Structure 1
């Protein structure tokens, strides 16, 4: 129903087209590129239907009156410009993250979407997976889980040579936020979902960050304490083996997710669970060890995501919440690991 236009021939557009496709309330209507030559080839391999119009410019697609909404798979650097130009043309945006090089730029995109009354949603997929429902709640049980104390979050894949050298996520002019923007983002996001999505008191980075010659981050972490007994940590890197964990330590429960970003199988999703856990009298063993739940996801998360993009006309809000923490962490790295209080 909602005519979707893919602005940018990004490799990750191969997965989202599926989302769009599988979303019973959405269809892939338009798609552009710097050269319709590439858009034609992308549309071919990607099994794009025939009615799908092929454009050889971004301006073309933005002025395409038949565009109800857009998915923007462009490098972090083309958001502040192409996002404002998308809304001004009355088109709703599904913006890939990191949303922008800073909250300042994001707000400009938010306001612009507001002035034009359009719906904007970042590209963080996992928060739409069903598992994220029965767990966002698992942490809302003041008994089975209790009062949140701290929450850890990690993520780091292993950028081979070609990646560390050519991928756009190491280029200061393209996806200049590096590991932070591409990976830290997720950790930061979970660190918010565990806390009901409330900005933390302050934010402090750990020393020992790794930036390439151009100064792009390759690895770094940080603690974000709500100063009221709550703290947390994230961790991202382009130099370590694939790992995706969420550690949440509550007063009465403990939650753990070995995946969370892209599950093992798009069909099912699982997470840990533990409450009133203790040892027997002689501390010779655990009396009741943590259990692992599970939920069926008949529709992939990117699918469930796009099937939710239909917001006729929070999302732009929680995006700014993580984008913000994103900057705090980045500001801290260079502002001599200072604590970045968030108002």
Structure 2
């Protein structure tokens, strides 16, 4: 029933197109490019239904009164103008990660959204995966996991030379946050989720961040601190074999997932779990190796995403949880970027 337009014919749109009408309370009703040509091409390539209204401009798609909500895979640096213009037409927004170039810009967006009573949500797929509920459940269990001590997350991939010269992620004027915004993002969200959405008190990047000639981050890392003795580390890179880890350790347990951003298969999600582990009397064996658990997921996680995204009929307020999680993730992103610019200085989040 909920009608979605696609603002921008980027590559990530194909996967989300499929999510939109694996639906099943949401549907593709419009697509827009800067070029009618390309929007035309995109719609047929991706088998969009005949009734899909096909726009040759962003402005034009915003203006179409038979679209409830937009999906916006636009470069990061377009978000502040175009998410705002869209809020302003009563479009609800599914905004791609990272949400903006900084938290000031993202506060504008959210304001516009509140102002118009629309829902905003960000592109983060993995948090809607049923596994994620199981992850949060384990981390909340005071006997299987206990009190949290550390969480370590990372995501890296090896961009080919074409990617390193050409992709929007290496360009300061589009996706200008680089590996931090594109991959660090996810490592930050996992550490925030593990920590019951509590912000850290301080952030400090690791020496040795790689920038490209244009000053844009190819790889970097950080520790976060809650001054509790809970801490976390993030790591991300454009220059190293695909790897995507969560490792989280508490007083009574340990949690591992190795495919946390994109599962191995869409059909399943597995995570590994270990509680009060130890050695036999002689330390020649562990008494019990970690347990592996796997969950059937009939509906892919991105489909769960639009699903939950898809008030207009019952008159509720928007759910502030989403923009709120998004602001927190973007704040850590800026602390990290600002610790590097300031030469690896400890950044207070007060």
Same topology, TM > 0.5: yes
Structure 1 residue 340 displacement after superposition = 1.3
Counterpart-to-counterpart distance in 1, 2:73 and 2:95: 7
Structure-2 separation of matches of 1:88 and 1:306: 21
Between the aligned partners of 2:97 and 2:292, the Cα distance in structure 1 is: 30
**Cα offset for 1:225?**
0.9
- Provide Cα deviations, 1:270-301, integer angstroms capped at 9, x if missing partner: 01100010011110110011101111110001
How many angstroms does 1:336 deviate by?
1.6
Paired position in structure 2 for 1:36: 36
* Structure 2: distance between partners of 1:60 and 1:205: 43
* 2: CA distance, partners of 1:21 / 1:333: 42
Q: Could you give the per-residue CA deviations for residues 149-201 of structure 1, whole angstroms, max 9, x where no partner exists?
A: 00000100101100000000000001000000000000000001111111011
Instruction: Tell me the CA shift for residue 140 of structure 1.
Output: 0.4
**SS in structure 1 at match of 2:101:** coil
Measured after TM superposition, the shift of residue 338 of structure 1 is 1.1
* Alpha-carbon distance, 1:247 to partner: 0.8
1:11-70 deviations in Å (ceiling 9; x for gaps): 000000000010110000011000010000000010100000100000000111111001
1:101 match: secondary structure: coil
**Cα RMSD for the two superposed structures:** 0.5
State how far apart, in whole Å, the 2-side matches of 1:171 and 1:36 are. Answer: 25
**Distance in 2, Cα, partners of 1:24 & 1:263:** 22
Say which SS state the counterpart of residue 348 (structure 2) adopts. coil
CA–CA separation in structure 2 for the residues paired with 1:27 and 1:76: 25
Can you give the 5+ residue segments of structure 2 that lack an aligned partner in the other structure? 311-320
- Bigger strand fraction: 2
For residues 91-125 of structure 1, the C-alpha deviation after alignment (integer angstroms, 9 at most, x for no partner) is: 00000011000000000000000011100000010
| Match in the other structure for 1:326 | 333
Distance 1:251 1:80 in 2: 42
Q: Secondary structure at the match of 1:241?
A: strand
Alpha-carbon distance in structure 1 between the residues aligned to 2:231 and 2:263: 26
Counterpart-to-counterpart distance in 2, 1:340 and 1:296: 41
Task: Provide the TM-score with structure 1 as the length reference.
Answer: 0.99
SS of equivalent residue, structure 1 residue 293: strand
Q: Which residue of 2 aligns with 1:288?
A: 288
Q: What is residue 316 of structure 2 aligned with on the other side?
A: none
Where do residues 78-97 of structure 1 align in structure 2 (5 Å cutoff)?
Answer: 78-97=78-97
- What is the SS of the residue equivalent to 2:219? strand
Alpha-carbon distance between aligned partners in 1 of 2:340 and 2:227, rounded to the nearest angstrom: 20
Q: What is the count of residue pairs matched by the alignment?
A: 340
1:266 deviates by 0.4
Give the Cα separation in 2 of the matches to 1:341 and 1:257: 30
In structure 2, distance between residues paired with 1:320 and 1:239: 27
Q: Distance in 1 between matches of 2:177 and 2:203?
A: 17
Shift of 1:145: 0.2
Q: Distance in 2 between matches of 1:292 and 1:201?
A: 34
Q: Secondary structure at the match of 1:135?
A: helix
Secondary structure of the equivalent of 1:9? coil
1:202-234 superposed Cα distances (whole Å, 9 cap, x missing partner): 111000000000000000000001011100000
Instruction: Report the Cα distance in structure 2 between the residues aligned to 1:327 and 1:292, rounded to whole angstroms.
Output: 36
2:233 partner SS = strand
Q: List 4+ stretches of structure 1 deviating above 4 A.
A: none
State the secondary structure of the residue aligned to 2:134. coil
Q: 1:339 maps to what in 2?
A: 346
By how many angstroms is 1:236 displaced?
0.3
Give 3-state SS (helix, strand or coil) of 1:203's partner: strand
How far 1:335 moved relative to its partner? 1.1
